[PDB]
Amino acid sequence: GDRVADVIESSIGDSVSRALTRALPAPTGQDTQVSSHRLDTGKVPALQAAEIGASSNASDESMIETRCVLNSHSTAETTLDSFFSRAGLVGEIDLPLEGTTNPNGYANWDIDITGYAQMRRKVELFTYMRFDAEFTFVACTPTGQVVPQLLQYMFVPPGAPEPDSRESLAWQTATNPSVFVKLSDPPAQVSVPFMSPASAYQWFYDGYPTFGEHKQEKDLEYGACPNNMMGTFSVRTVGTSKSKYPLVIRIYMRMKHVRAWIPRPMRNQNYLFKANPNYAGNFIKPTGASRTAITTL
């Protein structure tokens, strides 16, 4: 009844092998002879050599422990977490008593990396990443003087509406987690989990309840001014009215549990915009400091 079938795409033989646990290296190799050692014997100069092997005080004997330096410091400040060590000042939200920047107390901010070009440079060596997040908040007057006042913080998950006015019920809500603390108290250490809808951070169609990706016909990547609905922040001044002091809030983001994938060449042009790595195609520049000649330095 059935007359057609073909898959193949297989190989047979030495696929796998025995199962052991021997994480200790042993003397490997020795020597082998070739020919008459000469300088200009005719074929090739500058001949080679070989060794046998040894691994610290573990492998082979442990009679003498003569390391290069008598235990100066640690030798592993190169991992991914080590690279992503500090916590840079990402957010610099400013609240005046009166003015045009933030008159109604409310101030909306969202997570991004383009705020720091250096941070973007350091973070765009790869394609796929997966990390947690933390945040710390410091509030001070422009002249640096603590005052008695209460503040309201809240995190906004992706796709949640935007609280615009102080009277917005989104301030009340129940689902958006909120934090209350006086500014005289120590800063508000807090963590944020991995909120992406995939296994790695990558933009395109990931935001908005509607469609997305390239070549729009059914969606706008605008969402008014808050483009790319994602994890944002909100902050008020607690009170039925205005406050009595100017405020200068600050943010401190810090990665943790960092894992990368697929490295790529870093960058050799100045950044121009957000979410669109353009460059100065008419003002293309070299990379290193060029010298005069090649024969001389």
């Binding site: 169609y205 908005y208 509607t210 483009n227």
Partner: peptide
Amino acid sequence: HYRAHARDGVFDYY
């Protein structure tokens, strides 16, 4: 991708 809006009002693809 369902909705990857960094801001609203720019994408209407559903």
